Amino acid sequence: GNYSVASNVMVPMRDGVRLAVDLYRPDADGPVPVLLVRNPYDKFDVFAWSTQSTNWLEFVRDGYAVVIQDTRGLFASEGEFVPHVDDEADAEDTLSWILEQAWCDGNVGMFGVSYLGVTQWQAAVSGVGGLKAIAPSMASADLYRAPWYGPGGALSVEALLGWSAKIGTQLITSRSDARPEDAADFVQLAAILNDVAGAASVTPLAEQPLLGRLIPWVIDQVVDHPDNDESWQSISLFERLGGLATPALITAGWYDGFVGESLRTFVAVKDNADARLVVGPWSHSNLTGRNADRKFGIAATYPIQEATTMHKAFFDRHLRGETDALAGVPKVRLFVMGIDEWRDETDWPLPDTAYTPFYLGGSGAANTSTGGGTLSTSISGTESADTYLYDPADPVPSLGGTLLFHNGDNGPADQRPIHDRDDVLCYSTEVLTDPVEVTGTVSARLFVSSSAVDTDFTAKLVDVFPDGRAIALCDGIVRMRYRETLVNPTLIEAGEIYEVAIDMLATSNVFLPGHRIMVQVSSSNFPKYDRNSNTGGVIAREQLEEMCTAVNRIHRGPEHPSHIVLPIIKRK
Amino acid sequence: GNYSVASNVMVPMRDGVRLAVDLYRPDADGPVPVLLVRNPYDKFDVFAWSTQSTNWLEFVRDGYAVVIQDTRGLFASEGEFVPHVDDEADAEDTLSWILEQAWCDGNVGMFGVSYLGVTQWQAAVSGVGGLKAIAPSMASADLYRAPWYGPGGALSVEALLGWSAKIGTQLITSRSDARPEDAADFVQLAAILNDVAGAASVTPLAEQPLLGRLIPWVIDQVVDHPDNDESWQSISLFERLGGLATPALITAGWYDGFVGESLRTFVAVKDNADARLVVGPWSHSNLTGRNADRKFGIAATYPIQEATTMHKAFFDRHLRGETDALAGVPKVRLFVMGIDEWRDETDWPLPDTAYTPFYLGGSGAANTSTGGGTLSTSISGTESADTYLYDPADPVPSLGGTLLFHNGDNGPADQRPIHDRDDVLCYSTEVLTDPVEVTGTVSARLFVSSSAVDTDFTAKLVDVFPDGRAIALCDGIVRMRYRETLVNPTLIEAGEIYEVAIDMLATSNVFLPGHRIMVQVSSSNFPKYDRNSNTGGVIAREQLEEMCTAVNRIHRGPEHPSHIVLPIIKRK
Ligand SMILES: *C1(O)O[C@H](CS)[C@@H](CS)O1
Ligand SMILES: *C1(O)O[C@H](CS)[C@@H](CS)O1
């Protein structure tokens, strides 16, 4: 039950650069199992991240050692900081050092959230036999796909500018000797964080005098590489995951920026080792279960003590060889929205999933929420088309969804403020008499045309309540040059009809009696994603005046059966 | 920089009952200064409260010892738990034990929030010379005045039922051997926490089968004692504060349940010792600076590292005798709303405060926001009166303000949802051409009459924005039987006019050009306060059908000059 703490122990890497760690070690007569956490936000500052993870001092009281490390070039560590590029090698060297110590029994694991989760996948590909289990929460194994770009090939601009300002702020506050420019730089960084959409609105997007000076990576890597090219593929771990046999405890949230990539990692590792999955209704910075126009109940609040119990059982099985430690623990545990209840499952995707088309239709134009747009399981009878103007100077504002830094605390947001826009097309079912459950991955297939040689298309799933609230669920985008591949883009021909897919991530929701199922279609969602210039040019290098408007069209009928694909679950 | 942790050290009280503590002790050759925290929410669970306080492991790395204690009858401690009644004696005995240890140098201090703050005032009155400084955040020295009743003599019913359910929940989860009834009790407690207004609506209020069984104190002490009688005066510390000479670092929030009582403690101790004050725009459970319809900026987020630096300087001065440790630190630091900026001051109340009457007036009736009610620095010219019906079956709903457990995360709430009610009287200034600052304590003087022998009157200060948002600032209530004293109540005569005072707590706000100053007057605010029955009976023992409606009247003019008193600050 007792322990000691040693601060700033210096660990040498292969190139001679030393990284700083803190050691939390139990009172014990011999060696013990060990857990590692790799952190870019100061190893000393434990209260900043721990409330989004576990009550991990319980692990120490129960006989585990815990090691917390400052990553390269930050706080007490030597070297120079660049995101992602040094973390594979630095993790390998750190695991090796731990295994060589007098107090380590040969069994090592990892846990943590966000960047503290990404670094676990980077450690897992090293081939170090002593690493017996990992637990990555709200994370990704492919950095292009989340959080910097996405499956549709658009830049996640609010995520990039917000995070870069956060990193810049801590660099100034952590300086040994203050610089003359520090005071003014601090003020400017606060202005970005108070107004992320404003920061994202300046053209050309690639000209960032403050952020480019403090963290050159923001332009040199992220903005300058819009294709999923060799620079991205190098830091990706995903294709290596299939060859591993390492147990993983994976956590995600329905309104979290990482949700699509978190779920993919579970599917990639489940066949070769013991994988577990937990998904709640959270966004990256709001784990409370409470939002402005939607409350999920006290059961929805991040369950930190239950999480601590589950993590300890998982590590007891895989690090301590206790064969019955996970008795009674489910493989998959989901918070099902609508009914607003936790429920156990045997697999993800769910076994009895019926992937069902809901077709776009209706009399007259589908523009605005008072138009005639419908959704039905029957193919539409008349050939029709809905048309709108997309102007880059006036994009559709982002409201909820998977926002990270710009208003990122209201995932299930009411959509009524944007329903009167002519560029927002709406399609709804009739009012439901019986419940319909949608749990799984979601996508759309649309037949589209444009006056331009490049543009974007968006789709958003919505639950309409009896009182009028139109609550967001999941959404996605396709940038037309990347319609067939993220690696080798090509332009389109003006006026020609194309069939395209939109990846809309995932959800779990029961649409209750008295509700409607609704879909919104458009060509922008700003600043969740950057805006298309409609020119075919290098988007981030263009002035707002260099950009063009586009006349865009959605085709629907017997020969052009545009639809959403819903993962339907029926439980009697 | 290094330290050790010893768990479950047992400390004997005067009656032989032992309380459990954890010891965080630095590597040191001899004795050190010591800080104590007294906690009813599990000493092991440090992440639950610490994010609302300080990064206190810095204190340990810098050479302070820290002691965290389970209070009597909870978790690892022996005995039986009853709120407040054992904490004076238990603190005295604990301080004495610390001073007798080999590792203590004779200097002791305290820090912490909420119940961990109340317990510091209970320790301070003990007369133990070794206690050199305290730091109570979001706390009170008079438990009737906050959080259970108030300066107006109404029960804070949502605070009582919510907290009692929280305490009940942790008792079940902490049991050694589970009871057959535990599973069902847990479900019922969750239902209260998901619907606090619903729980508060059941009549008679005093019949609480679940909460009365788990924690008898809820009825035996709180509900059964509506007068500020001998049972309350016994646990009060306030009158003893004037005779102390102990330095205190006091923190408060403008939307916090404890704000009035926190500020009073500063005024009580400032003349005899080194007192300091910090006030931000927070509510008890929302320290982010972000609300549904009002954002204060990133500077408003609870500044935990600056708080840690200030606490360490304060303890260095008073526990380590470092005379220049507080050089450059202000006596008072306030977040001024409107301008939304931190500002330093020399005293509270502010030196140049002009306590200025704003008189109620207008042509026609003041009922609803579209009535004719006005506010002016000039006394009204015509004798008039505004009249309404107050029905206990339909009280005015609580929206923001100082709510604790029922929707307690939206202090600066938009008031428009209640503006069409006939029982909500509205009075406003013209649109402002120059800024007006209101910083200090706030109160109202009203001339009133009723058809009943008892009733309530309420008043609420509001900032009207250019777009229409009507944002709540501070509010209060008077229960008519307690108009002259909280100790010895008397009834009123139907139809007679009385001049009464309403204590509206405190605020700091600049009303900017384009805004208006507004006041709302009514007879209810539920469930922030319980509802008056309008009978003169024992309110908590009455059925809803035993209650009466009341016709209430506000008088205004030259002979009845009803007004609000605003603390005006002018800075050129
Ligand atoms: C986590 O710590 O927050 C960031 C959100 S963009 C992310 C960067 S990989 O890690
Ligand atoms: C703090 O811990 O929260 C409670 C809000 S009513 C309060 C009880 S004295 O202490």
Ligand SMILES: [Cl-]
């Ligand atoms: Cl809701």
Ligand SMILES: [Cl-]
């Ligand atoms: Cl549940």
Ligand SMILES: [Cl-]
């Ligand atoms: Cl049709």
Ligand SMILES: [Cl-]
């Ligand atoms: Cl605002």
Ligand SMILES: [Cl-]
């Ligand atoms: Cl400021």
Ligand SMILES: [Cl-]
């Ligand atoms: Cl008048």
